Amino acid sequence: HIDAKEGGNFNYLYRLFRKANLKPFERDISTEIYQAGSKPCNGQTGLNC
């Protein structure tokens, strides 16, 4: 009733890709690009980035 809007409420982000599990009570706002394969990422969203 407060967090939903008729057009959509696109605040409230969440992380999906991390190189290791978080430890207890640890926070992470790293917002880097996460290479998923082995090719370098170069900070650009691409094939495995």
Partner 1 sequence: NIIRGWIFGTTLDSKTQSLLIVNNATNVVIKVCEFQFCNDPFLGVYYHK
Partner 2 sequence: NIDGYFKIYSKHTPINLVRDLPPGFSALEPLVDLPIGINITRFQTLLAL
Ligand X SMILES: *[C@@H]1O[C@H](CO)[C@@H](O[C@@H]2O[C@H](CO)[C@@H](O)[C@H](O)[C@H]2NC(C)=O)[C@H](O)[C@H]1NC(C)=O
- Residues at the contact surface with ligand X, assessed by CB under 6 A: 19-21, 23
Q: What are phi and psi of 38, to 5 degrees?
A: -115, -15
Sequence-ordered alpha helix ranges (H) in 1-49: none
Alpha carbons 24 and 3: distance in angstroms, whole number: 27
Only one of the segments 9-17, 18-26, 33-41 lies at the binding site for partner 2 (rule: CB under 8 A); that segment is 18-26
- Residue 24's binding partner, choosing from ligand X, partner 1, partner 2, none, with beta-carbon cut-off 5 to 8 A by kind? partner 2
Name which of 5 and 19 has its Cβ closer to ligand X. 19
Interaction with partner 1 in 8-37: which residues (CB under 8 A)?
27, 29-32
Question: Rounded to an integer, what distance in angstroms lies between the CA atom of residue 25 and that of residue 32?
Answer: 21
